Design a binder for this molecule. Structure first.
Ligand SMILES: CCCCCCCCCCCCCCCCCC(=O)OC[C@H](COP(=O)(O)OC[C@H](O)CO)OC(=O)CCCCCCCCCCCCCCC
Ligand SMILES: CCCCCCCCCCCCCCCCCC(=O)OC[C@H](COP(=O)(O)OC[C@H](O)CO)OC(=O)CCCCCCCCCCCCCCC
Ligand SMILES: CCCCCCCCCCC(=O)O
Ligand SMILES: CCCCCCCCCCC(=O)O
Ligand SMILES: CCCCCCCCCCC(=O)O
Ligand SMILES: CCCCCCCCCCC(=O)O
Ligand SMILES: CCCCCCCCCCC(=O)O
Ligand SMILES: CCCCCCCCCCC(=O)O
Ligand SMILES: CCCCCCCCCCC(=O)O
Ligand SMILES: CCCCCCCCC(=O)O
Ligand SMILES: CCCCCCCCC(=O)O
Ligand SMILES: CCCCCCC(=O)O
Ligand SMILES: CCCCCCC(=O)O
Ligand SMILES: CCCCCCC(=O)O
Ligand SMILES: CCCCCCC(=O)O
Lengths: 87, 30
């Protein structure tokens, strides 16, 4: 077991592996910081959008007049406004 | 100068149409 631990530490001690584990822990912490209660409607909307996109077997000008597209892009711009808040 | 040439690309046009269909699908009235 001493040899096994020695091999493990000598291979892991590279800065790449330590950085990888540190960033995995940081990713877990940040995902914990991110609030997901509000993210469930976003996930449902993403599901509907992916379904619509895969349903499709001068576009932007016609799309901007679409009320659904207008409301959706207004939602994305509200998202954009919310991020980077002055606080 | 890249966007003006890209918009005429049929592949880019179809791909951005797919992204706009995705955008339409999300936030659906339901
Ligand atoms: C007297 C009346 C004269 C005419 C009177 C006017 C004639 C033209 C009318 C307006 C046409 C565009 C309207 C606005 C389109 C929608 C808003 C917009 O701008 O949306 C940008 C977006 C680019 O996509 P984005 O990258 O922004 O996508 C976002 C993210 O990136 C996604 O992830 O859509 C486009 O560009 C589509 C329009 C393409 C260019 C339009 C002009 C080309 C021809 C002009 C000259 C024609 C001959 C003139 C001859 C003289
Ligand atoms: C009489 C005829 C006169 C000329 C006749 C007309 C002369 C000009 C012709 C039209 C040029 C742009 C066409 C439309 C380009 C594509 C549609 C568009 O608009 O796409 C926006 C996008 C920005 O990227 P986005 O951020 O939207 O990307 C999306 C997401 O963000 C990604 O994630 O592409 C651009 O802006 C590229 C064009 C740059 C500005 C064009 C005008 C500059 C010069 C004007 C004056 C010139 C001298 C005039 C001298 C008088
Ligand atoms: C004359 C230009 C025709 C463009 C057709 C673009 C695709 C329309 C159908 C989209 C789909 O449901 O797959
Ligand atoms: C004479 C030019 C008529 C253009 C009509 C375009 C219809 C297809 C638009 C693409 C789509 O419906 O997704
Ligand atoms: C309108 C200027 C302030 C809005 C952006 C503030 C958030 C960016 C910096 C966030 C941070 O320092 O962690
Ligand atoms: C009316 C055009 C004057 C010359 C502009 C040259 C730079 C155009 C933008 C090139 C780029 O975006 O890399
Ligand atoms: C006289 C100006 C000619 C411009 C041609 C630009 C060609 C390169 C465009 C960038 C790309 O092909 O991805
Ligand atoms: C002023 C319009 C001249 C004809 C342009 C035809 C191609 C328009 C762009 C179609 C596309 O983006 O797939
Ligand atoms: C066109 C106005 C309705 C489209 C947007 C509806 C979805 C946003 C709200 C979703 C929710 O309440 O969970
Ligand atoms: C000036 C009248 C002819 C041009 C109107 C085109 C409207 C197209 C649209 O509704 O997207
Ligand atoms: C008015 C004719 C000269 C300008 C046409 C430029 C077209 C460029 C392109 O196809 O992206
Ligand atoms: C007569 C054509 C006017 C410009 C149309 C541009 C577009 O909507 O793609
Ligand atoms: C009066 C001429 C209007 C041309 C622009 C049409 C549009 O982009 O929706
Ligand atoms: C003569 C130049 C007309 C404007 C061109 C703008 C562009 O496509 O970058
Ligand atoms: C008639 C002059 C057309 C200039 C615009 C060219 C383009 O952006 O594709």
């Amino acid at each position: 077991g001493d040899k096994v631990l020695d091999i493990l530490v000598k291979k892991a001690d590279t800065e790449e592996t330590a950085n990888t584990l540190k960033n995995l822990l940081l990713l877990f912490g940040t995902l914990g910081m991110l609030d997901v209660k509000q993210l469930e409607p976003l996930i449902l909307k993403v599901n509907a959008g992916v379904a619509s996109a895969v349903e499709q077997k001068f576009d932007i000008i016609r799309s901007l007049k679409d009320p659904e597209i207008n409301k959706s892009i207004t939602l994305l711009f509200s998202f954009l406004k919310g991020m980077g808040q002055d606080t």
